[PDB]
């Protein structure tokens, strides 16, 4: 069929199927099988349906795309508040309208007194945008990824306190940390990513089912210690 397109670093939706391994990972952000630990085989078919499928709700089964956890309107940030929340994310001022997991938690501006509770590892993203361009809309980038993962995302900082965004050899290699300080601030506090690979698999699963709404040329994702 299309063996010449498997792992060709270009997503081809005609080859994007579990049989063809999500176009050799090209359509699942380099994640081989986002459902590789999922105990039920046909969970991916139910991942995109906007309904709770309890048999697919385990962490191994990628929380059934949070449709058991966030069943109602709270599943998404309001689009009328989406530009405002991107503009006011991590600006050092508490904006309560953006202080929800679905809107990106205002980049933790309302929770400066809650200690960091980082997930294990670093989330590594290759974005086909130069570092300068990527950081020119970094608050928007983090806010949107925070909103998708339903947790707080920030750039990992180096010894000199600089964001770990490196040129890709064209693009960027972005290093992110996951701060679960408000994820674990209940109500259902079990729908929290314990590590960067868990988050990378979930993002791969969204890209595989074409339900990832991220306005950036995101090539791949992985978790690294």
């Amino acid at each position, epitope marked *: 069929a299309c063996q010449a397109k498997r792992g060709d670093q270009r997503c081809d939706r005609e080859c994007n199927s579990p049989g063809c391994g999500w176009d050799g990972g090209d359509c699942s952000l380099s994640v081989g099988d986002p459902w590789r630990q999922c*105990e039920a085989l046909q969970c991916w078919r139910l991942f995109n349906n906007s309904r709770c499928d309890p048999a697919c709700s*385990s962490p191994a*089964c990628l929380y059934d795309n949070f449709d058991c956890h966030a*069943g109602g309107r709270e599943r998404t940030c309001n689009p009328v508040y989406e530009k405002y929340c991107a503009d006011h994310f991590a600006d050092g001022r508490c904006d309560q309208g953006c202080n929800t997991e679905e809107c990106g938690w205002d980049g933790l501006d309302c929770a400066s007194e809650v200690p960091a509770l980082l997930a294990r590892g670093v989330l590594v993203l290759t974005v086909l945008l130069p570092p300068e361009e990527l950081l020119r809309s970094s608050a928007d980038f983090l806010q949107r990824l925070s909103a998708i993962l339903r947790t707080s995302l920030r750039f990992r900082l180096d010894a000199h306190g600089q964001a770990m965004v490196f040129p890709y050899h064209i693009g960027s290699v972005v290093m992110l940390e996951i701060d679960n300080r408000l994820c674990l601030q209940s109500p259902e506090n079990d729908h929290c990513f314990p590590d960067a690979q868990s988050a990378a698999d979930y993002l791969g699963a969204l890209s595989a089912v074409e339900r990832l709404d991220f306005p950036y040329p995101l090539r791949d994702v992985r978790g690294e210690p």
Partner: antibody, heavy 116, light 107 residues
Framework: QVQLVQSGAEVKKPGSSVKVSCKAS????????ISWVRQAPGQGLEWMGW????????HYAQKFQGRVTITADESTSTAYMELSSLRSEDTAVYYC?????????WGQGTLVTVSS | IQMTQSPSSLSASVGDRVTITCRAS??????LNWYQQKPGKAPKLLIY???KLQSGVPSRFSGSGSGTDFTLTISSLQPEDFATYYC?????????FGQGTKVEIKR
């Protein structure tokens, strides 16, 4: 403070059915899941399933498929576990717990005894 | 997923460092919880996600491990710590528990 209060101990004959209740107080059980876990006399713990009362979705352990019915009444902040075709092996303390994957909050446990 | 605890019974004294191990039949990453239970009482969550201490749980309780091997350590064992301890995987359905470690007083 959040508390889960269960119904009183039950005595049942084989083949009968039991319905145990669990009332949540303090928290408004709209944003949570209620789980059912049992413990036979000298034995360990066994998860039976769960319910998210906000949208009424339930999940069960395969071995309890068809015999267990988990429901909830939003207005009273109450979850129910109904177990049918009762056997002597069903004699246990049945716990109501909050959280799906891990449980911080527990009920006191309802003792059910199946004996002819 | 089969959870195996070791030992099943442990004898200790007040002040002792106590270690309880939990073996999962397959890798569960860090999706493991530890519970304490006293007779006629409901279990109590101590540790969630292998090493995270639940709020309101004394700091003398610590969890470690990843994959298939996990450890619950009680540093200066207090009188109120004599109870049964259970590990629990939360990676796949059904949620499964270890068969328990009873911690009794040495004499």
């Amino acid at each position: 403070q959040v508390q889960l209060v269960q119904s009183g101990a039950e005595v049942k004959k084989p083949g009968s059915s039991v319905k145990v209740s669990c009332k949540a107080s303090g928290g408004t059980f709209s944003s949570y899941t209620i789980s059912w876990v049992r413990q036979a006399p000298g034995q360990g713990l066994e998860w039976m399933g769960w319910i998210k009362p906000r949208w009424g979705a339930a999940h069960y352990a395969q071995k309890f498929q068809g015999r267990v019915t988990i429901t909830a009444d939003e207005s009273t902040s109450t979850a129910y576990m109904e177990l049918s075709s009762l056997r002597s092996e069903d004699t246990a303390v049945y716990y109501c717990a909050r959280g799906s994957f891990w449980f911080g909050y527990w009920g006191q446990g309802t003792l059910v005894t199946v004996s002819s | 997923i089969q959870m195996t605890q070791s030992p099943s019974s442990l004898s200790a004294s007040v002040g002792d460092r106590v270690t309880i191990t939990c073996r999962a039949s397959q890798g569960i990453n860090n999706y493991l919880n530890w519970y304490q239970q006293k007779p006629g009482k409901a279990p109590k969550l101590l540790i969630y996600d292998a090493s995270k201490l639940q709020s309101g749980v004394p700091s003398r309780f610590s969890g470690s491990g990843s994959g298939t091997d996990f450890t619950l350590t009680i540093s200066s064992l207090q009188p109120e710590d004599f109870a049964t301890y259970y590990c629990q995987q939360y990676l796949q359905y059904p949620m499964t528990f270890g068969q328990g470690t009873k911690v009794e007083i040495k004499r």
